[PDB]
Amino acid sequence: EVKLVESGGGLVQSGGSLRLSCATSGFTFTDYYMSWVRQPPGKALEWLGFIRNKANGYTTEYSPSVKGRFTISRDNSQSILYLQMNTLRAEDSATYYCARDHDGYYERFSYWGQGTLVTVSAAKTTPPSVYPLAPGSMVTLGCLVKGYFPEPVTVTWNSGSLSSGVHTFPAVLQSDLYTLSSSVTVPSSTWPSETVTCNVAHPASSTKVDKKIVP
Amino acid sequence: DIVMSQSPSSLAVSAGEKVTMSCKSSQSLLNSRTRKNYLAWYQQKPGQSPKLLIYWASTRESGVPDRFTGSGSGTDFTLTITSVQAEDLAVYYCKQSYNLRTFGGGTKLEIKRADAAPTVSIFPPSSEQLTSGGASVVCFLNNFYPKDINVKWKIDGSERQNGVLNSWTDQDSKDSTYSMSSTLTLTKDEYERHNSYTCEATHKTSTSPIVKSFNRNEC
Protein backbone atom coordinates (compact mmCIF):
# COMPACT_ATOMS: atom_id res chain seq x y z
CA GLU A 1 0.00 0.00 0.00
CA VAL A 2 1.36 3.42 -0.96
CA LYS A 3 1.61 5.88 1.93
CA LEU A 4 2.47 9.58 1.97
CA VAL A 5 2.39 11.47 5.23
CA GLU A 6 3.19 15.17 5.67
CA SER A 7 4.43 16.63 8.92
CA GLY A 8 5.81 19.93 10.21
CA GLY A 9 2.86 22.26 9.67
CA GLY A 10 1.87 24.70 12.39
CA LEU A 11 2.02 28.36 13.44
CA VAL A 12 4.92 30.55 12.30
CA GLN A 13 5.45 34.34 12.30
CA SER A 14 5.59 36.52 9.18
CA GLY A 15 9.13 36.57 7.80
CA GLY A 16 9.96 33.26 9.48
CA SER A 17 10.95 29.90 8.01
CA LEU A 18 9.45 26.43 8.29
CA ARG A 19 10.41 23.07 6.83
CA LEU A 20 7.83 20.39 6.00
CA SER A 21 8.52 16.69 5.60
CA CYS A 22 6.67 14.00 3.67
CA ALA A 23 7.37 10.39 4.65
CA THR A 24 6.71 7.82 1.95
CA SER A 25 6.50 4.05 1.57
CA GLY A 26 5.08 1.39 -0.70
CA PHE A 27 6.77 2.32 -3.98
CA THR A 28 10.28 2.71 -5.36
CA PHE A 29 10.93 6.31 -4.22
CA THR A 30 13.94 7.10 -6.43
CA ASP A 31 11.89 6.10 -9.53
CA TYR A 32 9.54 9.06 -9.00
CA TYR A 33 9.37 12.80 -9.26
CA MET A 34 7.69 14.27 -6.20
CA SER A 35 5.61 17.46 -6.10
CA TRP A 36 4.38 19.86 -3.46
CA VAL A 37 0.94 21.50 -3.83
CA ARG A 38 -0.80 23.89 -1.44
CA GLN A 39 -4.37 25.03 -0.80
CA PRO A 40 -5.33 28.11 1.18
CA PRO A 41 -8.50 27.46 3.22
CA GLY A 42 -11.49 27.40 0.81
CA LYS A 43 -9.36 28.16 -2.28
CA ALA A 44 -7.91 26.28 -5.27
CA LEU A 45 -4.91 23.95 -5.44
CA GLU A 46 -1.60 25.58 -6.36
CA TRP A 47 1.35 23.54 -7.67
CA LEU A 48 4.57 24.74 -6.03
CA GLY A 49 7.42 22.69 -7.39
CA PHE A 50 8.92 19.30 -7.98
CA ILE A 51 12.10 17.31 -7.53
CA ARG A 52 12.92 14.90 -10.34
CA ASN A 53 13.78 11.19 -10.08
CA LYS A 54 17.20 9.54 -10.09
CA ALA A 55 17.20 9.16 -13.90
CA ASN A 56 16.91 12.95 -14.11
CA GLY A 57 19.54 13.77 -11.45
CA TYR A 58 17.07 14.77 -8.76
CA THR A 59 16.90 18.36 -10.14
CA THR A 60 14.26 20.84 -8.95
CA GLU A 61 11.77 23.25 -10.53
CA TYR A 62 9.45 25.82 -8.93
CA SER A 63 6.36 27.86 -9.69
CA PRO A 64 7.11 31.57 -10.18
CA SER A 65 5.07 32.23 -6.99
CA VAL A 66 7.70 30.62 -4.77
CA LYS A 67 10.90 30.29 -6.88
CA GLY A 68 13.82 31.71 -4.88
CA ARG A 69 11.99 31.42 -1.58
CA PHE A 70 11.09 27.70 -1.23
CA THR A 71 13.48 24.74 -1.65
CA ILE A 72 12.60 21.12 -2.29
CA SER A 73 14.96 18.27 -1.30
CA ARG A 74 14.76 14.53 -0.78
CA ASP A 75 16.35 11.80 1.35
CA ASN A 76 16.73 8.78 -0.97
CA SER A 77 17.96 6.50 1.82
CA GLN A 78 14.78 6.92 3.91
CA SER A 79 12.29 7.94 1.17
CA ILE A 80 11.43 11.33 2.72
CA LEU A 81 10.58 14.49 0.75
CA TYR A 82 11.20 17.99 2.16
CA LEU A 83 9.97 21.56 1.55
CA GLN A 84 11.92 24.42 3.04
CA MET A 85 9.92 27.63 3.19
CA ASN A 86 11.56 31.02 3.84
CA THR A 87 10.36 34.60 4.33
CA LEU A 88 6.85 33.37 5.02
CA ARG A 89 3.87 35.69 4.59
CA ALA A 90 0.11 35.52 5.33
CA GLU A 91 -0.52 34.40 1.69
CA ASP A 92 1.49 31.24 2.48
CA SER A 93 -1.11 30.12 5.04
CA ALA A 94 -2.45 26.92 3.52
CA THR A 95 -2.70 23.15 3.62
CA TYR A 96 0.48 21.69 2.05
CA TYR A 97 0.33 18.34 0.26
CA CYS A 98 3.07 16.14 -1.12
CA ALA A 99 2.07 14.16 -4.19
CA ARG A 100 3.77 11.35 -6.08
CA ASP A 101 4.47 12.63 -9.62
CA HIS A 102 6.15 11.42 -12.90
CA ASP A 103 8.00 8.14 -13.30
CA GLY A 104 9.32 8.94 -16.81
CA TYR A 105 6.18 7.57 -18.44
CA TYR A 106 2.80 8.27 -16.80
CA GLU A 107 1.47 11.85 -16.60
CA ARG A 108 -0.43 11.80 -13.28
CA PHE A 109 -0.12 12.45 -9.56
CA SER A 110 -1.05 8.98 -8.37
CA TYR A 111 -1.06 9.59 -4.62
CA TRP A 112 -1.36 12.52 -2.21
CA GLY A 113 -0.71 12.87 1.55
CA GLN A 114 -3.34 13.95 4.08
CA GLY A 115 -1.80 17.47 4.09
CA THR A 116 -0.28 19.63 6.83
CA LEU A 117 -1.72 23.04 7.75
CA VAL A 118 0.59 26.08 7.94
CA THR A 119 -0.61 29.32 9.58
CA VAL A 120 1.45 32.48 9.24
CA SER A 121 0.38 34.87 12.00
CA ALA A 122 1.64 36.98 14.91
CA ALA A 123 -1.07 35.59 17.25
CA LYS A 124 0.01 33.26 20.09
CA THR A 125 -1.01 29.61 20.45
CA THR A 126 -4.16 29.29 22.60
CA PRO A 127 -5.50 25.85 23.64
CA PRO A 128 -9.25 25.21 23.31
CA SER A 129 -11.77 25.05 26.10
CA VAL A 130 -13.90 21.93 25.53
CA TYR A 131 -17.45 21.91 26.87
CA PRO A 132 -20.03 19.10 26.87
CA LEU A 133 -23.37 19.65 25.23
CA ALA A 134 -26.07 17.68 27.04
CA PRO A 135 -29.87 18.13 26.73
CA GLY A 136 -31.39 20.42 29.39
CA SER A 137 -36.33 8.14 19.73
CA MET A 138 -32.95 9.72 18.82
CA VAL A 139 -30.93 12.00 21.08
CA THR A 140 -28.41 14.60 19.91
CA LEU A 141 -25.36 15.40 22.06
CA GLY A 142 -22.32 17.58 21.35
CA CYS A 143 -19.03 19.24 22.26
CA LEU A 144 -18.18 22.92 22.02
CA VAL A 145 -14.50 23.51 21.24
CA LYS A 146 -14.04 27.17 22.02
CA GLY A 147 -11.38 29.84 21.76
CA TYR A 148 -8.31 28.20 20.22
CA PHE A 149 -5.54 29.23 17.83
CA PRO A 150 -4.26 28.17 15.30
CA GLU A 151 -6.25 25.59 13.39
CA PRO A 152 -6.68 22.69 13.27
CA VAL A 153 -8.41 20.61 15.89
CA THR A 154 -9.59 17.01 15.56
CA VAL A 155 -12.83 15.73 17.09
CA THR A 156 -13.91 12.11 17.30
CA TRP A 157 -16.63 10.39 19.31
CA ASN A 158 -15.92 7.22 21.35
CA SER A 159 -12.40 7.06 19.86
CA GLY A 160 -13.81 6.96 16.33
CA SER A 161 -16.31 4.13 16.90
CA LEU A 162 -19.22 6.59 16.54
CA SER A 163 -18.77 8.16 13.09
CA SER A 164 -22.24 7.82 11.56
CA GLY A 165 -24.58 10.68 12.56
CA VAL A 166 -21.67 12.96 13.52
CA HIS A 167 -21.58 16.58 12.28
CA THR A 168 -18.44 18.55 12.98
CA PHE A 169 -18.98 22.22 12.14
CA PRO A 170 -16.23 24.15 10.43
CA ALA A 171 -14.36 26.49 12.76
CA VAL A 172 -15.18 30.17 12.72
CA LEU A 173 -12.73 32.90 13.57
CA GLN A 174 -14.06 35.65 15.87
CA SER A 175 -11.92 38.11 17.84
CA ASP A 176 -8.66 36.31 16.84
CA LEU A 177 -9.74 32.85 18.15
CA TYR A 178 -11.47 29.86 16.54
CA THR A 179 -14.51 28.05 17.84
CA LEU A 180 -16.08 24.91 16.51
CA SER A 181 -18.71 22.43 17.63
CA SER A 182 -19.55 18.84 16.91
CA SER A 183 -22.86 17.01 17.24
CA VAL A 184 -23.58 13.31 17.47
CA THR A 185 -26.98 11.67 17.23
CA VAL A 186 -27.53 8.24 18.84
CA PRO A 187 -30.56 6.10 19.88
CA SER A 188 -32.12 7.40 23.12
CA SER A 189 -32.01 3.80 24.43
CA THR A 190 -28.18 3.93 24.36
CA TRP A 191 -27.55 7.16 26.26
CA PRO A 192 -26.97 7.67 29.12
CA SER A 193 -26.96 3.85 29.63
CA GLU A 194 -23.88 3.62 27.33
CA THR A 195 -21.05 6.21 27.52
CA VAL A 196 -20.65 8.98 24.91
CA THR A 197 -17.33 10.87 24.94
CA CYS A 198 -15.87 13.44 22.50
CA ASN A 199 -12.12 13.21 21.99
CA VAL A 200 -10.54 16.53 21.05
CA ALA A 201 -6.97 17.26 20.04
CA HIS A 202 -5.26 20.60 19.30
CA PRO A 203 -1.81 19.71 17.99
CA ALA A 204 -0.44 23.27 18.25
CA SER A 205 -0.80 23.14 22.04
CA SER A 206 -0.46 19.33 22.27
CA THR A 207 -3.90 19.40 23.90
CA LYS A 208 -5.67 16.01 24.33
CA VAL A 209 -9.14 16.05 25.96
CA ASP A 210 -11.79 13.40 26.45
CA LYS A 211 -15.10 14.89 27.56
CA LYS A 212 -17.75 12.44 28.77
CA ILE A 213 -21.29 13.63 28.08
CA VAL A 214 -23.07 13.31 31.47
CA PRO A 215 -26.88 13.65 31.84
CA ASP B 1 2.71 30.79 -19.22
CA ILE B 2 -0.08 28.11 -19.12
CA VAL B 3 -3.38 29.43 -17.86
CA MET B 4 -5.95 26.76 -16.82
CA SER B 5 -9.61 27.76 -16.50
CA GLN B 6 -12.63 25.74 -15.45
CA SER B 7 -16.37 26.14 -15.93
CA PRO B 8 -18.82 26.32 -14.27
CA SER B 9 -17.60 27.61 -10.93
CA SER B 10 -20.33 25.61 -9.28
CA LEU B 11 -23.55 23.74 -10.05
CA ALA B 12 -26.06 21.34 -8.41
CA VAL B 13 -27.38 18.17 -9.98
CA SER B 14 -29.90 15.58 -8.70
CA ALA B 15 -28.85 11.95 -8.09
CA GLY B 16 -29.16 9.90 -11.30
CA GLU B 17 -28.65 12.86 -13.69
CA LYS B 18 -25.68 13.77 -15.89
CA VAL B 19 -22.95 16.31 -15.00
CA THR B 20 -20.74 18.08 -17.57
CA MET B 21 -17.85 20.37 -16.67
CA SER B 22 -15.12 21.97 -18.70
CA CYS B 23 -11.43 22.80 -18.58
CA LYS B 24 -9.59 25.16 -20.95
CA SER B 25 -5.82 25.57 -21.40
CA SER B 26 -4.26 28.72 -22.87
CA GLN B 27 -1.94 26.48 -24.90
CA SER B 28 -2.47 23.06 -26.50
CA LEU B 29 -1.60 20.19 -24.13
CA LEU B 30 -1.17 17.71 -26.97
CA ASN B 31 2.42 16.40 -26.96
CA SER B 32 3.38 15.80 -30.58
CA ARG B 33 6.06 13.23 -29.65
CA THR B 34 3.92 10.95 -27.45
CA ARG B 35 0.57 11.92 -29.08
CA LYS B 36 -1.11 12.35 -25.70
CA ASN B 37 -2.77 15.31 -23.98
CA TYR B 38 -1.08 16.05 -20.63
CA LEU B 39 -4.29 16.79 -18.75
CA ALA B 40 -5.55 15.09 -15.57
CA TRP B 41 -8.69 15.41 -13.43
CA TYR B 42 -8.71 15.25 -9.61
CA GLN B 43 -11.69 14.91 -7.23
CA GLN B 44 -11.55 16.56 -3.83
CA LYS B 45 -14.32 15.55 -1.46
CA PRO B 46 -14.99 17.78 1.55
CA GLY B 47 -12.22 17.58 4.14
CA GLN B 48 -10.21 15.11 2.01
CA SER B 49 -7.05 15.22 -0.15
CA PRO B 50 -7.44 15.36 -3.91
CA LYS B 51 -7.76 11.95 -5.60
CA LEU B 52 -6.73 11.13 -9.18
CA LEU B 53 -9.66 10.27 -11.48
CA ILE B 54 -8.52 10.65 -15.09
CA TYR B 55 -5.17 11.26 -16.80
CA TRP B 56 -3.89 11.70 -20.37
CA ALA B 57 -7.35 13.38 -20.85
CA SER B 58 -9.32 10.11 -21.17
CA THR B 59 -7.58 7.31 -19.20
CA ARG B 60 -9.70 6.39 -16.17
CA GLU B 61 -7.49 5.38 -13.22
CA SER B 62 -7.98 1.85 -11.79
CA GLY B 63 -10.71 1.82 -9.17
CA VAL B 64 -12.52 4.92 -10.44
CA PRO B 65 -16.23 4.29 -11.15
CA ASP B 66 -17.07 3.90 -14.87
CA ARG B 67 -19.53 6.83 -14.56
CA PHE B 68 -16.54 9.28 -14.75
CA THR B 69 -15.33 9.92 -18.28
CA GLY B 70 -12.71 12.38 -19.49
CA SER B 71 -12.71 13.67 -23.05
CA GLY B 72 -11.33 16.44 -25.22
CA SER B 73 -8.03 17.42 -26.79
CA GLY B 74 -5.68 20.34 -27.36
CA THR B 75 -7.01 23.33 -25.41
CA ASP B 76 -10.47 22.02 -24.35
CA PHE B 77 -11.36 19.19 -22.04
CA THR B 78 -14.50 17.79 -20.42
CA LEU B 79 -15.28 15.61 -17.43
CA THR B 80 -18.66 13.92 -17.64
CA ILE B 81 -20.33 12.10 -14.75
CA THR B 82 -23.29 9.98 -15.78
CA SER B 83 -25.81 8.76 -13.17
CA VAL B 84 -24.35 11.04 -10.49
CA GLN B 85 -24.49 9.69 -6.92
CA ALA B 86 -24.71 11.52 -3.58
CA GLU B 87 -21.04 10.62 -2.84
CA ASP B 88 -19.85 12.54 -5.96
CA LEU B 89 -20.18 15.82 -4.06
CA ALA B 90 -16.71 17.40 -4.46
CA VAL B 91 -14.57 20.04 -6.09
CA TYR B 92 -13.12 18.76 -9.38
CA TYR B 93 -9.77 20.13 -10.62
CA CYS B 94 -8.06 19.76 -13.98
CA LYS B 95 -4.26 19.98 -14.13
CA GLN B 96 -1.84 20.30 -17.06
CA SER B 97 1.61 18.66 -16.90
CA TYR B 98 2.83 19.69 -20.39
CA ASN B 99 5.14 22.37 -18.94
CA LEU B 100 5.73 21.97 -15.20
CA ARG B 101 2.20 21.72 -13.69
CA THR B 102 -0.76 24.09 -13.22
CA PHE B 103 -4.21 23.47 -11.74
CA GLY B 104 -7.49 25.01 -12.87
CA GLY B 105 -9.58 26.86 -10.30
CA GLY B 106 -11.99 23.94 -9.69
CA THR B 107 -15.68 23.25 -10.26
CA LYS B 108 -17.80 22.68 -7.13
CA LEU B 109 -20.42 19.98 -7.64
CA GLU B 110 -23.34 20.05 -5.21
CA ILE B 111 -26.21 17.56 -5.11
CA LYS B 112 -29.82 18.66 -5.44
CA ARG B 113 -32.35 16.76 -3.34
CA ALA B 114 -35.92 17.06 -2.07
CA ASP B 115 -36.48 19.72 0.59
CA ALA B 116 -36.01 18.43 4.16
CA ALA B 117 -36.82 20.14 7.49
CA PRO B 118 -34.08 20.66 10.10
CA THR B 119 -34.01 18.72 13.36
CA VAL B 120 -33.37 21.37 16.00
CA SER B 121 -31.63 20.86 19.37
CA ILE B 122 -30.76 23.45 22.04
CA PHE B 123 -28.09 23.13 24.75
CA PRO B 124 -27.56 25.28 27.82
CA PRO B 125 -24.12 26.47 29.03
CA SER B 126 -22.09 23.82 30.86
CA SER B 127 -21.20 24.37 34.54
CA GLU B 128 -17.51 24.05 33.51
CA GLN B 129 -17.93 27.09 31.25
CA LEU B 130 -20.04 29.10 33.67
CA THR B 131 -17.43 28.66 36.36
CA SER B 132 -15.03 30.66 34.08
CA GLY B 133 -17.48 33.57 33.66
CA GLY B 134 -18.92 32.74 30.25
CA ALA B 135 -22.16 31.29 28.96
CA SER B 136 -22.54 29.81 25.47
CA VAL B 137 -25.92 28.54 24.33
CA VAL B 138 -25.80 26.21 21.32
CA CYS B 139 -28.42 25.32 18.76
CA PHE B 140 -27.91 22.53 16.20
CA LEU B 141 -30.08 22.61 13.07
CA ASN B 142 -29.35 19.22 11.49
CA ASN B 143 -30.02 17.51 8.17
CA PHE B 144 -32.01 20.06 6.17
CA TYR B 145 -32.26 21.12 2.52
CA PRO B 146 -31.89 23.58 0.91
CA LYS B 147 -28.99 25.39 2.63
CA ASP B 148 -30.81 28.69 3.22
CA ILE B 149 -32.11 28.94 6.78
CA ASN B 150 -32.85 31.66 9.33
CA VAL B 151 -32.12 31.41 13.06
CA LYS B 152 -33.21 33.91 15.73
CA TRP B 153 -32.28 33.93 19.36
CA LYS B 154 -34.85 35.21 21.87
CA ILE B 155 -34.07 35.84 25.55
CA ASP B 156 -37.14 36.23 27.82
CA GLY B 157 -39.11 36.54 24.59
CA SER B 158 -37.03 39.39 23.09
CA GLU B 159 -34.88 38.93 19.97
CA ARG B 160 -31.09 39.31 20.39
CA GLN B 161 -28.59 39.56 17.45
CA ASN B 162 -25.25 40.46 19.04
CA GLY B 163 -23.00 37.58 20.28
CA VAL B 164 -23.80 34.88 17.61
CA LEU B 165 -21.50 32.31 15.78
CA ASN B 166 -23.11 30.55 12.80
CA SER B 167 -21.45 27.66 10.93
CA TRP B 168 -22.72 25.40 8.10
CA THR B 169 -21.32 21.98 7.31
CA ASP B 170 -20.44 21.03 3.75
CA GLN B 171 -23.20 18.97 2.16
CA ASP B 172 -23.54 15.41 3.51
CA SER B 173 -22.08 12.69 1.23
CA LYS B 174 -24.77 10.18 2.10
CA ASP B 175 -28.04 12.14 2.36
CA SER B 176 -27.15 15.41 0.55
CA THR B 177 -28.38 17.59 3.42
CA TYR B 178 -26.84 20.50 5.30
CA SER B 179 -26.47 21.15 8.98
CA MET B 180 -25.84 24.40 10.86
CA SER B 181 -24.69 25.31 14.36
CA SER B 182 -25.58 28.62 15.99
CA THR B 183 -23.85 29.65 19.22
CA LEU B 184 -24.91 32.62 21.36
CA THR B 185 -22.26 33.70 23.84
CA LEU B 186 -23.02 35.87 26.88
CA THR B 187 -21.23 36.76 30.04
CA LYS B 188 -22.31 34.77 33.09
CA ASP B 189 -23.50 38.04 34.67
CA GLU B 190 -25.86 38.78 31.75
CA TYR B 191 -26.91 35.12 31.36
CA GLU B 192 -28.06 35.13 34.98
CA ARG B 193 -30.41 38.12 34.41
CA HIS B 194 -32.82 36.18 32.24
CA ASN B 195 -34.66 32.90 32.26
CA SER B 196 -35.94 31.82 28.84
CA TYR B 197 -33.44 31.03 26.02
CA THR B 198 -34.92 30.23 22.63
CA CYS B 199 -33.52 29.11 19.21
CA GLU B 200 -36.10 29.70 16.38
CA ALA B 201 -35.40 28.20 12.96
CA THR B 202 -37.32 29.28 9.87
CA HIS B 203 -36.83 27.13 6.80
CA LYS B 204 -38.82 26.97 3.55
CA THR B 205 -40.18 23.53 4.56
CA SER B 206 -42.70 25.15 6.91
CA THR B 207 -44.38 28.46 7.51
CA SER B 208 -44.09 27.60 11.23
CA PRO B 209 -40.64 28.24 12.76
CA ILE B 210 -39.20 25.34 14.74
CA VAL B 211 -38.83 26.61 18.32
CA LYS B 212 -36.47 25.06 20.87
CA SER B 213 -36.14 26.60 24.32
CA PHE B 214 -34.87 26.00 27.83
CA ASN B 215 -35.46 27.90 31.09
CA ARG B 216 -32.58 28.61 33.49
CA ASN B 217 -34.82 27.80 36.53
CA GLU B 218 -35.29 24.26 35.18
CA CYS B 219 -31.57 23.39 34.92
Ligand SMILES: C=CCO[C@]1(C(=O)O)C[C@@H](O)[C@@H](O)[C@@H]([C@H](O)CO[C@H]2C=C(C(=O)O)O[C@H]([C@H](O)CO)C2)O1
Ligand atom coordinates in the same frame (compact mmCIF):
# COMPACT_ATOMS: atom_id res chain seq x y z
C1 LIG C 1 12.47 13.65 -19.20
C2 LIG C 1 12.39 15.01 -18.97
C3 LIG C 1 11.22 15.67 -19.15
O1 LIG C 1 10.10 15.47 -18.29
C4 LIG C 1 9.43 16.70 -17.75
C5 LIG C 1 10.44 17.50 -16.97
O2 LIG C 1 10.40 18.75 -17.14
O3 LIG C 1 11.18 16.89 -16.20
C6 LIG C 1 8.27 16.27 -16.80
C7 LIG C 1 7.12 15.65 -17.61
O4 LIG C 1 5.95 15.49 -16.76
C8 LIG C 1 6.73 16.47 -18.83
O5 LIG C 1 6.27 17.76 -18.38
C9 LIG C 1 7.97 16.75 -19.73
C10 LIG C 1 7.63 17.57 -20.98
O6 LIG C 1 6.67 16.80 -21.67
C11 LIG C 1 8.89 17.76 -21.85
O7 LIG C 1 9.26 16.43 -22.28
C12 LIG C 1 10.48 16.18 -23.04
C13 LIG C 1 11.58 17.02 -22.84
C14 LIG C 1 12.78 16.32 -22.60
C15 LIG C 1 14.04 16.95 -22.00
O8 LIG C 1 15.05 16.22 -22.11
O9 LIG C 1 14.01 18.08 -21.44
O10 LIG C 1 12.89 14.97 -22.91
C16 LIG C 1 11.70 14.14 -23.05
C17 LIG C 1 12.08 12.74 -23.56
O11 LIG C 1 12.76 12.09 -22.50
C18 LIG C 1 12.98 12.73 -24.80
O12 LIG C 1 12.72 11.58 -25.59
C19 LIG C 1 10.58 14.87 -23.83
O13 LIG C 1 8.98 17.46 -18.96
Ligand SMILES: [Mg+2]
Ligand atom coordinates in the same frame (compact mmCIF):
# COMPACT_ATOMS: atom_id res chain seq x y z
MG1 LIG D 1 17.09 21.57 -13.83
Ligand SMILES: [Mg+2]
Ligand atom coordinates in the same frame (compact mmCIF):
# COMPACT_ATOMS: atom_id res chain seq x y z
MG1 LIG E 1 -26.59 14.14 9.05
Ligand SMILES: [Zn+2]
Ligand atom coordinates in the same frame (compact mmCIF):
# COMPACT_ATOMS: atom_id res chain seq x y z
ZN1 LIG F 1 -30.29 41.49 29.90
